[PDB]
Structure 1
């Protein structure tokens, strides 16, 4: 696989920790999940003209991100995968 610049390729964790008190159980509130594993990373960012300036993440990072329309979503041979612009990534 091969990301097409600015892009980071990840996969999200499962939606909501159903045990999050310690013992207390829950169903689903119907949110999503902010945590993902990084699978592949773009060359950098082209615009501003001074080189292709590289991204901050690497493969095998566990990232936290803003789960909005700058994140894109896909299904490869049954696997959940996602592709964002780096500007939605908040932290490792």
Structure 2
């Protein structure tokens, strides 16, 4: 498993960073802040070593660092690193990967 700035998740946790806030629209209009919620697209920066549940050898996380992923809506813990909010999910909870 790979770490981040003085941080390392345990057994499954993945530390991701949500993407931009989408302030303005596509064409020409601009949006407020109470709207737009939390962006579900994120990038993975920290990955736990391997899955505790796997018998004998640990089962390594599948999402590798530097990937873009479609986060779920609810599950996730807020961590603060360098005054930047990062979100720690579980590897099972990550919906999809933006491979391209």
TM-score (norm 2): 0.75
* CA deviation after TM superposition for structure 1 residue 50, in Å: 5.1
Stretch of structure 1 that moved more, 17-26 or 79-88: 17-26
Structure 1: which 5+ runs fail to align?
Answer: none
Aligned-residue RMSD, C-alpha: 1.8
1:11-61 residue CA offsets vs partner (Å, 9 max, x unmatched): 11243x233332222213251111112111112222152531122111111
> Residues 11-90 of structure 1: matches in 2 within 5 Å?
11-15=17-21, 17-28=22-33, 29-49=35-55, 51-68=57-74, 70-90=75-95
TM-score (norm 1): 0.80
Structure 2: which 5+ runs fail to align?
Answer: 1-6
Count of matched residue pairs: 90
